[PDB]
Design a protein around this ligand. Sequence first.
Ligand code: NA
Length: 472
Amino acid sequence: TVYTFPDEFKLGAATASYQIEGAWDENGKGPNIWDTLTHEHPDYVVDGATGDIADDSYHLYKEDVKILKELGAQVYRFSISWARVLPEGHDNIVNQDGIDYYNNLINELLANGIEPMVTMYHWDLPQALQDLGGWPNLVLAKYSENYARVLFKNFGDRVKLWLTFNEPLTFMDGYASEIGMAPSINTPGIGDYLAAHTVIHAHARIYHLYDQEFRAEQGGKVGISLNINWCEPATNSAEDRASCENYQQFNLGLYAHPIFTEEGDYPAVLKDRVSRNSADEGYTDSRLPQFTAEEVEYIRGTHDFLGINFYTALLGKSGVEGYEPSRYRDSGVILTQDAAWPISASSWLKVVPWGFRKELNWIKNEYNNPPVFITENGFSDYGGLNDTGRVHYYTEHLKEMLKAIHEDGVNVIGYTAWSLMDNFEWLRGYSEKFGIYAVDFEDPARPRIPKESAKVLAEIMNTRKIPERFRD
Ligand code: NA
């Protein structure tokens, strides 16, 4: 039993637009902040890589569907490029080529028995909107609503699973470093919080829009994809436990407390620690933006499920470190990794599968067991088809998830592996490989070829169980 997927559980794989599509200026697509970063600041990216071509999925989408069908995916999670649909960011111009492209992908998926799951925003903000300040500027919440309306109107007759945002915890950091994630702005502890605030408002507007304009007719579900690392106490002390709770609240709770709790608003510890730190440093006003009571009520409850991206764990101990001001310093935890944990090709990613089960339980308890869709989980290497590390990563994480479901009663409803294929890994370029299919980025045809992990995942998807040879 503990090794079998529930009958209704959905298995598949995931990608994101900038990471795979290419065709960055083709057929009317406007520029986004990742076009800007990779063109103007190749020094920020391994190898000076760009997403100009990537996997060429703009042209090769039928090949993506082919490998999804081979895999036996029930669901394909992909994102829509805002500037491919609305090249000016605002909704005055709708690019028919972009509409056609995503319709073609959706129709090809459905014709092959694969359900689309669409992320509206996976980090590729139109440059025209960044030029107003981007996410720190609250005007983007209405612009986001208008973008979502175009998506629901055009695609919602065939798409029943939506994610408003992917990893705002990550993309807010694009406003906390001059050399990091697009748009590479250095406003740590100030602009990143403003970005989060706008995103939360935007998410809520999109959810209400769906309720008001589309749900009765379309009958789908709207969630949001939040990343979170498990944070294990470095020692069993109450003090180290407190630091790990701080971590959860400052990373997951920042977004999930406003949306997924009955109370809404930011977590109290977030409000209180930032207020105290801001006062101590002489600011008249807290660096953390505030919601009014009316906003709190508007935002809370704006969900049909919780999307989770899970990869790894950290150790947390009592204390404070980081630069003043910053979210990490405000969070009141000292974070490390255990040297014993297996490594990957990514500095930040260690293999800690039991952390996945711990995190799922934390979520169950904090948010009253919401339906949870695992929208990403995966592992990096530098290359190779005999990807034993990736196979082990998947089989262990799936086993831990199945224990969470069957032993712990966590309502996990689906899982999409990150990623269907090797792709443009942001500031790491093509140097870190997360695919279950390999792609030759030196071959203009960008062939996708299965790794051992694709074969093992196909076996898991076909049999709906963890094969005996991978069991404890
Ligand atoms: Na339209």
